[PDB]
Design a protein around this ligand. Structure first.
Ligand code: PLP
Ligand code: PLP
Ligand code: GAB
Lengths: 290, 298
């Protein structure tokens, strides 16, 4: 059901540079540095009614993530055509239908070959209908200071890397606390991001989000959230947001490409009011864009 | 292919005779599904084990630590008897095809599995090790900020500190940073200034006739090689000590080693461009002890 493409020309030093492969058969060598060391980057792109959302920003961020890990530069033209070909292959077979997504995976390759690996696959996504009406959240220490990306770039803060064990570990801690998700806080007390998403704060009538140089991802959904609010007439701001400001905010959301906007009903067990109509308009906009 | 690969089909506790829990597979062919959480999320644990003269070194310690890493990641308990059997069968198959000769290694990989499926994945492969003869004579090292407080394992267990996980992108990034500075390896230093470990090794400190190593609740691995290194030094009358070692104390050390299963003991010639003496005979004796310890057990 899922479409998988192998990307045979993923990076820059009439061949398409990618081939269809069997999603249900093994495809990665046991010594691919992507699995023995989590040494790669990825992007997840939502595909709504056959259109990839924020395609160019996603491809640019793949290059940015690759650069942070000293990977070779991704061949934008090939990755672009592979996303489009995989969506086209999925829709032809499974027809039109629900929300889809394309996942791009780029690794340093089989150990010892100096030849990076790449895959794109396209599948139907998990159902987020409930999560888009509300989620509970806890804050968790991320260990790093908010300025790691300036002092210590070998820690890869702000790279969308394959090494997400700790991100997953954060989800499990949240579930043990009855929560659905996490907002990370830096060791010096600043709100950062979620394990798979960015945080949006409505406070003092302003739509805020932690500045993107604090070792976090510049979210593509977050940027689109800002366009929504700016056109609707809210002011928007990139800021350093302390842990305390978080709990004093009027309202909160986690946002990301596939789930879109998920409003926070509780943060660390303190309740927050969810404006159902405002969030519904937000998610309608996020789902309908370009 | 030269290397041996075993698929572990019963990696974890929740069997018919004839089902050992593992079967040979082609190391040269693709083996992992693209949605295995081991590659999409680096969500798994691993062990690397030196195999000297047909024998895996410290096999039970490694298996114990596989389980400990598994537990830190909320994975199910690895079936120690399947993994043990899998490693020995792998060593056996490698040697029956390739003969003996040479230092080998076995690598154990355990992941949360194909996503949506609730079934961990597991693999073992055996292959010839990298030539470390030069590094065993000396390496240049630099100190790099790890970003964590020495105590993150106590306060923040979701940060997986002290787990041997597949999410090693940063450990590799540290090596690339050291190479930029013309160095071979890295000693991590915590936010609060404590010597921790290397991205793939543990740190041994000689100072004032005492052999020390950072104590292993500081969000670091308890190294199987470090334990064998303590055995060597105690046998020669050195006192050994686990403790907190500030980055300052590390500079004032008389000698330093990075130790790990495959490279064994690599003596440090320079740390952040400060020179350190290397006792070539004592280190050669250390490596000879480290290479020969498992023969005793058999
Ligand atoms: C750590 C992290 N933060 C934020 C995001 C949100 O990115 P996007 O909105 O582009 O999907 C992702 C994905 C992520 O992995
Ligand atoms: C992060 C890390 N530290 C230390 C070590 C050393 O452990 P061992 O001597 O058992 O190989 C390893 C391996 C490691 O991955
Ligand atoms: N590269 C290499 C070296 C030796 C043997 C083989 C093999 O296929 O047996 C391969």
């Amino acid at each position: 059901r899922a479409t998988l493409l192998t990307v045979t020309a993923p990076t820059r030093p009439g061949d398409a540079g990618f081939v269809l492969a069997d999603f249900g058969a093994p495809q990665v060598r046991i010594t691919d540095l992507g699995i023995t060391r989590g040494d790669g980057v990825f992007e997840t792109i939502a595909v709504i009614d056959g259109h990839p959302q924020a395609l160019e920003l996603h491809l640019g961020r793949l290059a940015h993530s690759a650069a942070l890990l000293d990977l070779p530069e991704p061949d934008a033209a090939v990755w672009r055509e592979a996303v489009l070909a995989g969506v086209a292959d999925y829709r032809s077979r499974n027809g039109d239908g629900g929300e889809l997504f394309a996942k791009l995976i780029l690794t340093r390759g089989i150990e010892g070959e100096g030849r990076p690996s790449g895959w794109v696959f396209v599948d139907e996504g998990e159902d987020f209908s409930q999560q888009r009406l509300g989620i509970r959240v806890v804050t968790l220490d991320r260990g790093y200071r908010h300025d790691v990306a300036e002092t210590s770039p070998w820690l890869l803060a702000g790279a969308k890397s394959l090494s997400y064990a700790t991100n997953r570990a954060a989800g499990r801690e949240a579930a043990r606390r009855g929560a659905d998700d996490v907002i990370f806080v830096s060791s010096d007390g600043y709100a950062l991001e979620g394990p798979t998403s960015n945080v949006i704060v409505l406070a003092d009538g302003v739509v805020r989000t932690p500045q993107t140089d604090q070792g976090i991802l510049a979210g593509t959904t977050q940027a689109a959230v800002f366009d929504f609010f700016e056109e609707r007439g809210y002011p928007t701001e990139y800021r350093r947001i302390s842990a305390d400001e978080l709990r004093d905010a009027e309202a909160l959301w986690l946002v990301s490409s596939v789930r879109q906007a998920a409003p926070i009903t509780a943060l660390d067990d303190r309740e927050y009011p969810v404006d159902a109509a405002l969030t519904a308009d937000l998610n309608a906009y996020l789902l309908a864009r370009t």
